[PDB]
């Protein structure tokens, strides 16, 4: 669930 | 190396005109053009169960075709996989390994890769935490004389030099199975936030020179890749490597092409350069360097 590119 | 000058290398003055013509938004649009290029490669190893947990980010796999494979594995959970990509540099195959910030469960993989790939220099462009969010594990012994054993690789901290914007850590890697030792220099750049650009292109370029000098020095004492990592190992990593390539090509041939460099890099470290600001930074850092060097 860890995203590098998040909004 | 994929990073040949052709077919549209630009002189530094053409680069000035190019950036002037396109402006920030045109360069941002160019970055979007790069983001849309047909992604050549697959991510199956990254996505394999067993390897998923070895990715710091669910949205930052690494390409199958260019990944650094681990050979001397030990234990079920050590597959051949590390989220790490061979990256060509200017006139140099595999000048870099672009990799994520090691996770606790990939520390040993990381050092195995460093050992197997004969790495002499590690470049880390991340803090351990940003916003109290862990961005990178403390995968190396932080304090002089501290050591960590990663299986048959014992990493010992031989000294830490605290410079402006970076830290230089001299590590010994002792392969205790083969009774071999190697000094690795670990550079941690501290003033480059994720999703951001360094506070000072000049500071980054000086850091780049320090890294290059250390790589050259270490190599004169044995070309192994420089490990370059951030948190995901794509944004600051791609930007660092792209700038390095462009500056190296500029120095040697008086030409560069950011678009080619980044496009080609993204076929090796997928997703290299993560924001249009970083992409624009490549251009502006080069131009700023060019100005400071009287080239423009």
Coordinates of C-alpha atoms in Angstrom, one line a residue:
Chain A
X1 CA 0.0 0.0 0.0
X2 CA 3.1 2.2 0.2
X3 CA 3.1 4.5 -2.9
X4 CA 6.0 6.7 -3.9
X5 CA 3.9 8.9 -6.2
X6 CA 0.8 9.9 -4.3
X7 CA -1.7 12.8 -4.8
Chain B
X1 CA 26.1 2.3 -23.4
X2 CA 22.7 3.4 -24.4
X3 CA 23.9 7.0 -23.7
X4 CA 25.4 7.9 -27.0
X5 CA 25.4 11.5 -28.1
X6 CA 23.2 10.9 -31.1
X7 CA 21.2 11.7 -32.7
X8 CA 20.4 15.1 -31.4
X9 CA 23.1 16.1 -29.0
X10 CA 23.0 19.9 -28.3
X11 CA 25.8 22.2 -27.6
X12 CA 25.5 24.3 -24.4
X13 CA 24.5 27.4 -26.4
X14 CA 21.9 25.4 -28.2
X15 CA 20.7 24.1 -24.9
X16 CA 20.3 27.7 -23.7
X17 CA 18.2 28.5 -26.8
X18 CA 16.2 25.3 -26.4
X19 CA 15.3 26.0 -22.8
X20 CA 14.6 29.6 -23.7
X21 CA 12.3 28.6 -26.5
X22 CA 10.4 25.9 -24.4
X23 CA 10.4 27.7 -21.1
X24 CA 9.5 25.9 -17.9
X25 CA 6.1 24.7 -19.2
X26 CA 7.6 23.4 -22.4
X27 CA 10.2 21.5 -20.4
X28 CA 7.4 20.2 -18.2
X29 CA 5.5 19.1 -21.3
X30 CA 8.6 17.4 -22.5
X31 CA 8.8 15.6 -19.2
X32 CA 5.2 14.4 -19.7
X33 CA 6.3 13.3 -23.2
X34 CA 8.9 11.1 -21.5
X35 CA 6.4 9.8 -19.0
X36 CA 4.2 8.6 -21.9
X37 CA 6.9 6.8 -23.9
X38 CA 6.0 3.2 -24.5
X39 CA 7.6 1.5 -21.5
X40 CA 9.9 -1.1 -23.0
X41 CA 10.3 -3.9 -20.4
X42 CA 8.5 -6.0 -17.9
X43 CA 8.3 -6.0 -14.1
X44 CA 7.5 -9.6 -13.4
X45 CA 10.3 -10.2 -10.9
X46 CA 9.4 -7.1 -8.9
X47 CA 5.8 -8.3 -8.9
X48 CA 6.5 -11.9 -8.0
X49 CA 5.3 -13.0 -4.5
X50 CA 8.3 -13.2 -2.3
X51 CA 9.7 -10.1 -4.1
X52 CA 6.7 -7.8 -3.4
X53 CA 7.9 -7.3 0.2
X54 CA 11.3 -6.4 -1.2
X55 CA 9.9 -3.3 -2.9
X56 CA 9.7 -0.3 -0.8
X57 CA 6.9 1.1 -2.9
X58 CA 4.0 -0.8 -4.6
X59 CA 4.2 1.7 -7.5
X60 CA 8.0 1.5 -8.0
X61 CA 8.8 -1.9 -9.5
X62 CA 12.0 -2.3 -11.4
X63 CA 12.5 -3.6 -14.9
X64 CA 13.2 -7.3 -15.4
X65 CA 15.5 -6.6 -18.3
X66 CA 18.0 -4.4 -16.4
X67 CA 17.6 -5.6 -12.8
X68 CA 20.6 -6.4 -10.7
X69 CA 20.4 -10.1 -9.8
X70 CA 21.7 -11.5 -6.6
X71 CA 23.7 -14.7 -7.1
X72 CA 25.1 -15.9 -3.8
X73 CA 21.8 -16.3 -2.0
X74 CA 21.1 -17.7 1.4
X75 CA 17.8 -18.6 3.0
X76 CA 14.4 -19.1 1.4
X77 CA 13.5 -15.4 1.5
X78 CA 16.6 -14.3 -0.4
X79 CA 15.5 -14.6 -3.9
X80 CA 17.7 -13.3 -6.7
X81 CA 15.7 -10.1 -6.5
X82 CA 16.6 -6.6 -5.4
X83 CA 14.8 -3.5 -6.5
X84 CA 17.9 -2.3 -8.3
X85 CA 18.6 -1.5 -11.9
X86 CA 21.8 -1.5 -14.0
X87 CA 22.0 2.0 -15.5
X88 CA 24.4 3.0 -18.2
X89 CA 26.3 6.3 -17.9
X90 CA 28.0 8.5 -20.4
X91 CA 30.2 6.1 -22.6
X92 CA 29.9 3.6 -19.8
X93 CA 27.8 0.5 -19.5
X94 CA 26.4 -0.1 -16.0
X95 CA 27.9 3.2 -14.6
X96 CA 25.2 3.1 -11.9
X97 CA 23.0 0.8 -10.1
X98 CA 19.8 2.7 -9.3
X99 CA 18.1 1.2 -6.4
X100 CA 15.6 2.0 -3.7
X101 CA 16.4 2.8 -0.1
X102 CA 17.0 -0.5 1.5
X103 CA 14.4 -2.0 3.7
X104 CA 15.2 -3.9 6.8
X105 CA 14.4 -7.1 4.9
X106 CA 16.6 -6.0 2.0
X107 CA 19.7 -4.7 3.9
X108 CA 21.5 -8.0 3.3
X109 CA 20.4 -8.1 -0.3
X110 CA 21.7 -4.6 -0.7
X111 CA 25.1 -5.4 0.7
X112 CA 25.2 -8.6 -1.3
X113 CA 24.6 -6.6 -4.4
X114 CA 27.3 -4.1 -3.4
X115 CA 29.7 -7.0 -2.9
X116 CA 28.8 -8.9 -6.0
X117 CA 28.8 -5.9 -8.2
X118 CA 32.2 -4.8 -6.8
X119 CA 30.7 -1.4 -5.9
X120 CA 33.1 1.1 -4.5
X121 CA 30.8 4.1 -4.0
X122 CA 27.3 4.4 -2.8
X123 CA 25.3 7.6 -3.3
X124 CA 22.3 8.1 -1.1
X125 CA 20.1 11.1 -1.8
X126 CA 17.6 10.7 0.9
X127 CA 17.2 11.1 4.6
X128 CA 16.1 8.1 6.6
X129 CA 12.8 9.9 7.3
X130 CA 10.8 12.6 5.8
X131 CA 7.6 13.8 7.6
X132 CA 8.3 11.2 10.2
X133 CA 7.8 8.7 7.4
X134 CA 10.6 6.2 6.9
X135 CA 12.1 6.7 3.5
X136 CA 15.2 4.5 3.9
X137 CA 16.4 2.0 6.3
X138 CA 19.6 2.5 8.3
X139 CA 21.2 -0.2 6.3
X140 CA 24.8 0.6 7.3
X141 CA 26.6 1.0 10.6
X142 CA 26.1 4.7 11.3
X143 CA 28.9 5.4 13.8
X144 CA 32.6 4.8 13.3
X145 CA 33.7 1.3 14.6
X146 CA 30.1 0.1 14.5
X147 CA 29.6 -3.0 12.3
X148 CA 26.7 -5.0 11.0
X149 CA 27.0 -8.5 9.8
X150 CA 24.8 -9.3 6.7
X151 CA 25.5 -13.0 6.5
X152 CA 29.0 -13.4 5.2
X153 CA 29.4 -9.7 4.6
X154 CA 30.4 -7.7 7.6
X155 CA 30.1 -3.9 7.1
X156 CA 32.2 -1.8 9.4
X157 CA 32.1 2.0 9.6
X158 CA 35.6 3.3 9.4
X159 CA 34.8 7.0 9.7
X160 CA 32.3 9.6 8.9
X161 CA 33.1 13.0 7.4
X162 CA 30.3 15.6 7.7
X163 CA 30.5 18.0 4.8
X164 CA 28.2 20.7 3.6
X165 CA 25.0 19.0 2.5
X166 CA 26.5 15.5 2.6
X167 CA 28.1 12.9 4.7
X168 CA 31.0 10.8 3.6
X169 CA 31.1 7.4 5.3
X170 CA 34.0 5.0 4.8
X171 CA 32.8 1.5 5.1
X172 CA 34.8 -1.7 5.1
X173 CA 32.9 -4.7 3.6
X174 CA 34.5 -7.8 4.9
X175 CA 33.4 -11.0 3.1
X176 CA 34.1 -13.3 5.9
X177 CA 33.5 -16.4 3.8
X178 CA 36.0 -15.5 1.2
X179 CA 38.2 -13.5 3.6
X180 CA 38.2 -10.5 1.3
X181 CA 37.8 -6.9 2.2
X182 CA 36.9 -3.8 0.3
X183 CA 36.5 -0.2 1.2
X184 CA 33.2 1.4 0.0
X185 CA 32.6 5.0 0.3
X186 CA 29.0 5.9 1.2
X187 CA 27.9 9.4 0.3
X188 CA 24.6 10.6 1.9
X189 CA 23.3 13.8 0.3
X190 CA 21.1 15.5 2.9
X191 CA 19.5 18.5 1.1
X192 CA 17.5 16.8 -1.6
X193 CA 13.9 16.0 -0.4
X194 CA 11.8 13.4 -2.1
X195 CA 9.8 14.7 -5.0
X196 CA 12.0 17.8 -4.8
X197 CA 15.1 19.3 -6.3
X198 CA 18.3 20.0 -4.3
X199 CA 18.4 23.3 -2.6
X200 CA 21.3 24.3 -4.8
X201 CA 22.3 22.9 -8.2
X202 CA 25.8 24.0 -7.4
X203 CA 25.8 21.9 -4.2
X204 CA 24.6 18.9 -6.1
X205 CA 27.1 19.4 -8.9
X206 CA 29.9 19.8 -6.3
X207 CA 28.6 16.6 -4.7
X208 CA 28.6 15.0 -8.1
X209 CA 32.3 15.9 -8.5
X210 CA 33.0 14.5 -5.0
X211 CA 31.3 11.3 -6.0
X212 CA 33.1 11.1 -9.3
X213 CA 36.4 11.9 -7.7
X214 CA 35.9 9.1 -5.1
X215 CA 34.8 6.6 -7.7
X216 CA 37.9 7.5 -9.8
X217 CA 40.1 7.3 -6.8
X218 CA 38.7 4.0 -5.7
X219 CA 39.0 2.6 -9.2
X220 CA 42.5 3.7 -9.5
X221 CA 43.1 1.4 -6.6
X222 CA 41.5 -1.8 -7.8
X223 CA 34.5 -0.2 -13.7
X224 CA 32.1 -1.0 -11.0
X225 CA 28.8 0.7 -10.9
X226 CA 28.1 3.5 -8.5
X227 CA 25.2 2.6 -6.4
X228 CA 22.8 5.5 -6.5
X229 CA 19.7 5.3 -4.4
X230 CA 17.1 7.5 -2.8
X231 CA 13.9 6.2 -1.3
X232 CA 12.3 4.8 -4.4
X233 CA 15.6 5.2 -6.3
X234 CA 13.9 6.7 -9.3
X235 CA 13.3 10.4 -8.8
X236 CA 16.3 11.9 -7.2
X237 CA 18.3 8.9 -8.5
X238 CA 17.2 9.4 -12.1
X239 CA 17.9 13.1 -11.7
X240 CA 21.3 12.6 -10.2
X241 CA 22.3 10.1 -12.8
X242 CA 20.9 12.1 -15.7
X243 CA 22.7 15.2 -14.6
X244 CA 25.9 13.2 -14.2
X245 CA 25.5 11.8 -17.7
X246 CA 24.7 15.2 -19.2
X247 CA 27.6 16.9 -17.4
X248 CA 30.0 14.2 -18.4
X249 CA 28.9 14.3 -22.0
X250 CA 29.1 18.1 -21.9
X251 CA 32.6 18.0 -20.4
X252 CA 33.9 15.5 -23.0
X253 CA 32.0 16.4 -26.2
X254 CA 30.6 19.8 -25.5
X255 CA 27.2 18.4 -26.1
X256 CA 24.3 16.8 -24.2
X257 CA 20.7 15.9 -24.6
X258 CA 18.6 15.8 -21.5
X259 CA 15.6 14.3 -23.2
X260 CA 17.7 11.5 -24.7
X261 CA 19.5 10.9 -21.4
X262 CA 16.3 10.7 -19.4
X263 CA 14.4 8.7 -22.0
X264 CA 17.1 6.2 -22.3
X265 CA 17.7 6.0 -18.6
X266 CA 14.0 5.2 -18.1
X267 CA 14.5 2.1 -20.2
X268 CA 17.0 1.0 -17.5
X269 CA 15.9 2.4 -14.2
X270 CA 12.2 2.6 -15.0
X271 CA 10.5 5.8 -13.9
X272 CA 13.8 7.7 -13.6
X273 CA 13.0 11.3 -12.7
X274 CA 9.8 11.6 -10.9
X275 CA 8.6 15.2 -11.3
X276 CA 8.7 17.7 -14.1
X277 CA 10.5 19.9 -11.6
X278 CA 13.3 17.4 -11.4
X279 CA 13.3 17.1 -15.1
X280 CA 13.4 20.9 -15.5
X281 CA 16.1 20.9 -12.8
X282 CA 18.3 18.8 -15.0
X283 CA 18.2 21.5 -17.6
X284 CA 18.5 24.4 -15.2
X285 CA 21.4 22.8 -13.2
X286 CA 23.3 22.3 -16.5
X287 CA 22.6 25.9 -17.6
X288 CA 23.5 27.2 -14.2
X289 CA 26.7 25.2 -14.3
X290 CA 27.3 26.5 -17.8
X291 CA 26.9 30.1 -16.7
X292 CA 29.1 29.5 -13.6
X293 CA 31.7 28.0 -15.9
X294 CA 31.6 30.9 -18.4
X295 CA 30.4 28.6 -21.1
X296 CA 27.3 30.7 -21.8

